Amino acid sequence: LGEYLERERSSFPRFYFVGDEDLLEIIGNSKNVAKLQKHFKKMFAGVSSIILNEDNSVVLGISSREGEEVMFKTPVSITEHPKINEWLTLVEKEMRVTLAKLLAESVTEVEIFGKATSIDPNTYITWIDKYQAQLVVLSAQIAWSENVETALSSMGGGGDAAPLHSVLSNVEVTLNVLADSVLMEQPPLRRRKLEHLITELVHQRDVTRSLIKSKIDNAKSFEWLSQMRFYFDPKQTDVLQQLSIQMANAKFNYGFEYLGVQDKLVQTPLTDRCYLTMTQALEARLGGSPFGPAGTGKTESVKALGHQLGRFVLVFNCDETFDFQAMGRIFVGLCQVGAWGCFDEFNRLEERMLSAVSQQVQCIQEALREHSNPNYDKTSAPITCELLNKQVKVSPDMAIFITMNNLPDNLKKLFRSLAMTKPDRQLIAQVMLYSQGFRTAEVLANKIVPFFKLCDEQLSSQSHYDFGLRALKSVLVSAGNVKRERIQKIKREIAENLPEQEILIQSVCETMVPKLVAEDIPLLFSLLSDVFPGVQYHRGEMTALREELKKVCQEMYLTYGDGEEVGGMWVEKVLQLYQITQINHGLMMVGPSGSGKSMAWRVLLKALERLEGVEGVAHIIDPKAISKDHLYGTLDPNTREWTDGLFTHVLRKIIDSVRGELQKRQWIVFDGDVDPEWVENLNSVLDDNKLLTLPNGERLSLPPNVRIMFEVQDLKYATLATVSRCGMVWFSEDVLSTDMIFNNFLARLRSIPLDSPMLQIQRDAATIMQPYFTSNGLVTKALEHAFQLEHIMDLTRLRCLGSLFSMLHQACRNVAQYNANHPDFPMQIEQLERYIQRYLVYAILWSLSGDSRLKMRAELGEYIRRITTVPLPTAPNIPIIDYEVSISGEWSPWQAKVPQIEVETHKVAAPDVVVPTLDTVRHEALLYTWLAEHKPLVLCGPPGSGKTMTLFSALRALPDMEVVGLNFSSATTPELLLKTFDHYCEYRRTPNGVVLAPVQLGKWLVLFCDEINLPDMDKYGTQRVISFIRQMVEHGGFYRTSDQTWVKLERIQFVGACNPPTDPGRKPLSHRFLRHVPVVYVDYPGPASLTQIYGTFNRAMLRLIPSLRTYAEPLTAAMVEFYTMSQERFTQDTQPHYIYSPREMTRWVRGIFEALRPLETLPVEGLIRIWAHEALRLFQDRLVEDEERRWTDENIDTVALKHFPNIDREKAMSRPILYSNWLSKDYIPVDQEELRDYVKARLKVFYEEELDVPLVLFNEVLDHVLRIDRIFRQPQGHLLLIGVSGAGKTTLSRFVAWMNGLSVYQIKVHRKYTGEDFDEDLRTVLRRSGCKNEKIAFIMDESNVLDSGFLERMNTLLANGEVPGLFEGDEYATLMTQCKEGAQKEGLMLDSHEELYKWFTSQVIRNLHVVFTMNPSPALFNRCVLNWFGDWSTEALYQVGKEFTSKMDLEKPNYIVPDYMPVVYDKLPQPPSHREAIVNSCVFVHQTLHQANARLAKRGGRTMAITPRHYLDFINHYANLFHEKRSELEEQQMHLNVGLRKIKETVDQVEE
Amino acid sequence: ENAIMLKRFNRYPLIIDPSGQATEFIMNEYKDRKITRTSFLDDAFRKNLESALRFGNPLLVQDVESYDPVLNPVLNREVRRTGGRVLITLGDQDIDLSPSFVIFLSTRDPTVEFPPDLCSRVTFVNFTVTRSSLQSQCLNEVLKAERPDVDEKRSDLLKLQGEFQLRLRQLEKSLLQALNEVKGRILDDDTIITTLENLKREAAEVTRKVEETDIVMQEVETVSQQYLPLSTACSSIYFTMESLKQIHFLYQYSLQFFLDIYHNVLYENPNLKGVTDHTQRLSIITKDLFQVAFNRVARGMLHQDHITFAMLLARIKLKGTVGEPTYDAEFQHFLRGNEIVLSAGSTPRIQGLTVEQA
């Protein structure tokens, strides 16, 4: 099959341009031509379709993309030539032939035309309409060149009787005719033909006037040879030899390829030099490399040179749209057919890719060079080259151009370099202005070009700004259109007196000013004043549209104004948007988040509908919310069936217009962000092409009444290609003033029922609060002050204002409820006023700075107290934030509303119990307020602040809400949300559209998504799930991608809670989403709050032991005091894990409760001892330096004696304070010595049977084992084990697990380890620990953690007690079954899924413990017990050496005791023995290794860590070396003695 | 010393060597054991280690900077000895430990910062050439070549500690076996006394050596102090030639190259054909070392930079020469001390003196 494809390509060389699957489509669908014209624009320069007969049997002609068609002189028949290749070649040859014949006829006409004076415009217009644009330009050039040639031939004598002046006058009269004609109303094709003609004729005039009339009379003089000369000899039978083109000494044959209506590039001196250099390079068969800065006119230059010679030119952009499988075949095609290829920017190529294409280009260029061998000019053997590992023939006409901005060393000797750094902009403009019809083009050019230079320099640098030559050229064509439109307007009421400077200023302002930021508008107008003196712009009045805008705005509760009035900037932006809508499709609406963008175009659309009477329909679609494939559609790799995407479906529905989509203004608004991934298909639709290229082959064209809208905030991750194709309006934040926000809120409050009595209440409230929402009122000044203030998240004006409005609405609802509760004596005017004003102040306080620290809130409250006039809480100590506005209209402390709750003994520090406090009693009020309006909110605070449980309890307190706990991992994508809706919600098609609602009726499903900011940021600065949430919140729905329908959310709410963005792993939320979600900073509880909550906990605790009941309060007070001392010191700056949260206190209380639960009848002594034990194990053992530990101990006994002065110190001088339960039945504080002996024997057995290496026991190992046994003893226990590698923490933990019965589980990590194997392992351990009562010790190491997903999974495991994302589908059902089996084994009923899952979570948190090891994220440091497994001390090293060196014969009775050697302070004897000296030397050796590493780090670095594993290896090496050498010495001595005895025997033999 | 570390070890070593010399060494040392080359980046590395672990085949893994955590249980030398069979857990796969199994981690880049977990399980053996390493190498070469007698005396001092004693012990054992074979016959007296007199001569030589160890040590110290400046100059020359890469990318040189100039100047030296005086030969070898090093460097070096390397060699010879001022201050001013802020008080002085010259 592939061989047949290659043979078909060889039969028709142009097939090499289309793809292999494309060629398969061509060959398969040869019978029906309707699918051919989709690809006919690939192998031909301009041919876009073929004019076939009624039966598609013959090809009468071809048609270009612009609609221009060429009629074949002799049409060919597909019936006579059925095979695709033969009739395609016939079509090509016939196209060339008719092109030549049309050229001959046109030349015959223009010969009569030029050799005349005062040409009639009518005959000229008939002539130009008769032929094509390319044809008419070529005829003009040929006629002019032949006339000049005849003139110079007549100039043999000299300058006498020169008809060169006659030729110049003929060109001038032709210019006059063209200038007159272009001024009138012409069809667009005729307009383009006129444009090309006048450009070429202006170039001819400029050449003849100077470059030929400089006393030049010889037709062979180089001044004429340098210019492009045309020579036509129609008598040649061959088509390729009819027209001869020459440049200096280089001659070429016109390829006569059809190019349709191409853009004729303006001829300039740089363009000339470029033509001369390129033709010289081609004549020597060399490559052309016109290097230079981008935008200087390089690729187009080459393209226009190719168009001049009538050669097909191909452009290969290198902007990652690069491949070899296609480039090899198109290179083959270039060598075969004889077309041209230009690379846009060769430097962009990847190194290997660049080298490969360089090798291919080198082969092709060597073939080209050999094609012109002076010895082998008569090319008998065809010139061939090596591409695709096969012989390819190279046509001599083929040319390759590489455009740069250096060249690879391969092609340095093969490519001629040209430096076009600066294009002649003044001439480029002059020609464009003259072509547009202006009669003073040169002055306008001299004004406009420096103006563009200034705008590029004087204006601030922006990504979206563009002042390139292309920008200037466009502006000029817009000016020409404006002048023509004004001519038409004045005519409908010669006309050369127009102030064209004003026209150009109007065009440039209408095209720029919408894209200028607010600060740059005065700069641009000053620039225009400086360049154009006293020429002012006049904006069109648009009075009818202004009236419609005012009517719509007053209907939509919007402020409307003109010019300097409030909202004048906004309405001017709307008018600019409407003008840009007129000018072109595909507009860009861009501004800071919170500006008037969406509703600006909404109001414009409604005003258009009411004015023109054309119904307007807008389709809002979020690109980042859905995948690109789903946005466009997918092609199945097997069935090759196409399903349209959202944009594809919408466009198809509009085009078909089955319901009458046409005759209605359709706008596709792309609300969201723009990045070069989802817009790569939109380049073809956005430009003048206006056609969508589906990958299957379907072609969709944009109808004229359809405009594309992007509502993008920043426009920074977008390529220049996307923006440069867009007329774009910038909506600076200064456009949207706070005054119109206030007026809109007041109008909505006065009109929209917050649900007639409610209307009356709302109107009274609004009348009351109107003074504060003034220009310089309370609210504006408060906003200004809070903007200076510091916030945990970026402060956005719209977010704060929206939250404030929501809380004011809740105040109105509270008034309505109060009137409902009192049907008699309703709310009065004065009491309503008091309540509303106080609520306004409280609302500003909780909205502004509501997301900041306590001291920042206090500062803001002080500012409000300074600036406001309303009464405030008279108490001078308590901050205003602690107060509230009662329904009666007076400030009351929040502490009054906090109840005293007594919890059951077994519920102490339970996972879900919440003790109300002032923080909680405020957060519940704010939560209820903001959920009354279904506004999503985010609780932000440091880890362990209690956000999750406050949120959960407050949500479950309301009866009508269904709470859903959703954990957002770093890899969270919308599909999780869609699965959530599928599992909980249902789709209903009963109403006007699809509606997604919870299955439960009358239940408000709330998606509590904790860690809202954790989802990772993509490459282009967007979070897909966050954008999805925003799309639901702002628009009220989303697009169901299965059927591309707009399903409207109902009874759905969103609630978030996340750590501060500064914490590692957290990314700041997008401002657009942040606008709709108020944030409340949930700081750590205040000391009074801890005292209350933990006094409640202790009172519930001490009911077990009645004797200590009255001692609960001092215990709580001392606990809180010690926690505060530990918090004010040991800041995270000193150590990353020095983090203290109330979760530590909860673990503390749980530990004391576990200690007390077995035990009965404890005195105060035991209670204080256990308290001190827990404090030590939770605070002292997480520190590093001994000073921290001693400070902790001293402060602990200090506070203990402070709050218990009556008790003695019997628990104080006890230094060890060691608790265990191995020696007896319960957790008694046993004595150090006997437990030491017991654990020594235990580890002896352990390493005898389990391990394979002896384990020593020192004091550090002992106290570590105590901590470790403690931590598995407690429920929901997890250790953080911080220490140097090899210190034995894993070994010690495994020993403790073995001795306490818990099995050990280790995650076996490899390079191929991914997330799914990890969650499988988590499923395994949870199943083995939850379903079964078996207790698992989880070994976690830093090496086992590869990605943050593991870390967050483990984090939710520790905090929640279970990870909801593990069990779905069959796995969840298996958990159902196994947990029911476990419940019936234990003696419990199964009930439903939720109760059994609760029991499973309880089992996991009671029968699972996770240890974590790390060498020295705040979330990981919290929710675990931090134990500092510091390096082995000097005493530890001494004991290790002494135990490990006991075997050796190291006893020397004759040892002499020297002085000093102070290394081990606790040396066993005062006079050291030989073995003691040796072990001291060993530990000194280790100490010197540490010191040497420290010194090496000080002076330079490159130091490897020194670990106790090194010391153990050194001890092993010492033992082996000592034993081996002593064995050798002793065997030598024994051999000596044996030999001595034998020699004595030989001596006796001698004597005998 | 590094080979000593390789031979006797408990934790598996990791080889650090800029060259391939150590890898070649470990290759030749374990051909009998069928040592297989492997790298971490290779996909077949897992199956290679499993196969080698099955037969106890020695392994070497290159590219250790991309270390595979899968080797942690093997590095830890954990043993699941159960049922009389030694066992390890390699991920999900369980393998028996064939004895005589060794693994040698390897790398080529001197500057690799390994994590501490990899640090603790491995014995670092380093082959990087330094100032002191090349200094001592050049000293050993120069004593070996120029003064073979002092080199032999040094070797004798080295062997006197253990090797000579072992040789004497083995000769005594040979005497023992001869005597018990002959049963001390009076007829065997000639052979017995010949052997005993040779043993007595060897013992007397050993005793003279241990009685002269101070004199030989002092002579070796004097000769080493005499020859130290040459080796310091050689180390400076090599490190200058190595750092030459900063000026131009074309100036890469190896230690093999410098060893080649050192060997060429030491042995194939025309100047040292007729010279015999030790100090004269040392001066000649120093001068010829400088000259030949400069010639061989500059033959393939840019013309505009010849003066730079000549200046570097001048400074090195100045540092190596004796009886001269240190000239640190003048050289520092010449190099960088020109660019010190001194614009204040810039008087024109004499009319022939310009502002920048001022």
Ligand SMILES: Nc1ncnc2c1ncn2[C@@H]1O[C@H](COP(=O)(O)OP(=O)(O)OP(=O)(O)O)[C@@H](O)[C@H]1O
């Ligand atoms: N006359 C008015 N014209 C426009 N907006 C007004 C007017 N009066 C008040 N507003 C307020 O201006 C805001 C317009 O915000 P808009 O919907 O345009 O934002 P957006 O561009 O979608 O924001 P983002 O960039 O974050 O996506 C609303 O809060 C609206 O109530």
Ligand SMILES: Nc1ncnc2c1ncn2[C@@H]1O[C@H](COP(=O)(O)OP(=O)(O)OP(=O)(O)O)[C@@H](O)[C@H]1O
């Ligand atoms: N009012 C309260 N009632 C009960 N427990 C509380 C209260 N305030 C704080 N806590 C305790 O403080 C800790 C806070 O729990 P949790 O870690 O879920 O909170 P968080 O601040 O939302 O944490 P994270 O950011 O890690 O999710 C728990 O130990 C909880 O028992």
Ligand SMILES: Nc1ncnc2c1ncn2[C@@H]1O[C@H](COP(=O)(O)OP(=O)(O)O)[C@@H](O)[C@H]1O
């Ligand atoms: N000689 C020319 N006459 C008129 N316009 C030109 C000429 N050369 C380039 N341009 C204009 O330059 C713009 C494209 O420049 P670009 O292709 O980016 O330049 P380069 O190839 O140097 O990178 C278009 O508006 C094109 O019409």
Ligand SMILES: Nc1ncnc2c1ncn2[C@@H]1O[C@H](COP(=O)(O)OP(=O)(O)O)[C@@H](O)[C@H]1O
């Ligand atoms: N107290 C000890 N006595 C003897 N050997 C120990 C001791 N602590 C640790 N080791 C040795 O250290 C080796 C590795 O310890 P390991 O548990 O890996 O430390 P870490 O958990 O810090 O990595 C073990 O093989 C063990 O033999």
